[PDB]
Amino acid sequence: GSLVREWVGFQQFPAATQEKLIEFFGKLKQKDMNSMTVLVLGKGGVGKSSTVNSLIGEQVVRVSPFQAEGLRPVMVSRTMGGFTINIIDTPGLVEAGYVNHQALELIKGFLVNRTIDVLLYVDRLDVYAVDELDKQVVIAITQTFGKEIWCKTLLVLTHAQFSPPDELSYETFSSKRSDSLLKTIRAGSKMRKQEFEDSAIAVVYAENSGRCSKNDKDEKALPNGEAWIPNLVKAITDVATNQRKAIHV
Ligand SMILES: Nc1nc2c(ncn2[C@@H]2O[C@H](COP(=O)(O)OP(=O)(O)O)[C@@H](O)[C@H]2O)c(=O)[nH]1
Ligand SMILES: [Mg+2]
């Protein structure tokens, strides 16, 4: 009785987002790609589940303030028009004051005979933190995966609609928060520091909350003004298309 699931969530996205999303995917189909596997890593409570639930369009993955449990990666697979998109929602990687290696390989296991196209690294925008337990996370990642991971990676900051209190210019605030994070990755995963500049990772901002508010065509927009879901897949898409090796060997 099961083959996969009909992306009922898509029919749910506003028109401008539907037709925009139909474009990006149309690209892969033509490049002989009728599937896309996205992974999602990061610390707990950053907004992995919230975001995935956002992209697919339904309540697939469960969100939670206390994301101290979980402990087993779930894959979400929806299809339509002959195209299949799947996201792997990985459990938090920080387990009480430190990286959780138990689960980190539990992830490395979930994907043994698989192929990854895009990896999403999430953290929160509303954080001003010089997080270095952070620097740890960035290491463990390169430890399990490695060289290919960051080239096929993307940085997502959630709570993209965080009004920086008492001091301004969300743009002056956003970058410092993006830069450092990028900086921690260029530096943390030792390989990249000079070469980092060679390819560049890039960032995408997201606002999963139901209070995000809209725009002309009723699609979740950022303060910046554009739709984050639509342009977010654009990114997952460009990365899925650029022919680097993929999480391999
Ligand atoms: N990602 C995200 N979470 C938000 C946002 N606004 C509020 N939240 C809250 O932060 C929590 C994130 O939970 P979840 O995504 O499950 O964390 P995960 O463990 O990384 O998957 C939710 O319970 C939301 O109530 C937002 O813009 N983005
Ligand atoms: Mg989760």
Swiss-Prot record:
Transmembrane segments: 36-52
Chain residue ranges for the region called Homodimerization: 64-67, 124-129
Modification sites for Phosphoserine: S180
Phenotypic consequence of gene deletion: Plants exhibits a pale yellowish phenotype.
Swiss-Prot/TrEMBL induction comment: Up-regulated by CIA2 in leaves. Induced in light but repressed in darkness.
Listed result of changing S199A: Normal phosphorylation
Effect of S174A: Normal phosphorylation
Tissue/organ expression: Mostly expressed in seedlings and flowers, and, to a lower extent, in roots, stems, and leaves.
Documented effect of changing D218N: Normal GTPase activity
Protein's membrane topology: Single-pass membrane protein
GO cellular component: chloroplast; chloroplast envelope; chloroplast outer membrane; extracellular region
Enzyme class: hydrolase
Co-factor: note: Binds 1 Mg(2+) ion by subunit.
Occurrences of domain AIG1-type G (ranges): 33-249
Function: GTPase involved in protein precursor import into chloroplasts. Seems to recognize chloroplast-destined precursor proteins and regulate their presentation to the translocation channel through GTP hydrolysis. Binds GTP, GDP, XTP, but not ATP. Probably specialized in the import of nuclear encoded photosynthetic preproteins from the cytoplasm to the chloroplast, especially during early development stages.
Subunit structure: Homodimer, heterodimer with TOC34 and TOC159, and monomer. The dimeric form has a higher GTPase activity than the monomeric form. Part of the TOC core complex that includes 1 protein for the specific recognition of transit peptides surrounded by a ring composed of four proteins forming translocation channels, and four to five GTP-binding proteins providing energy. This core complex can interact with components of the TIC complex to form a larger import complex.
Protein family: Belongs to the TRAFAC class TrmE-Era-EngA-EngB-Septin-like GTPase superfamily. AIG1/Toc34/Toc159-like paraseptin GTPase family. TOC34 subfamily.
Name assigned to this protein: Translocase of chloroplast 33, chloroplastic
Gene: TOC33
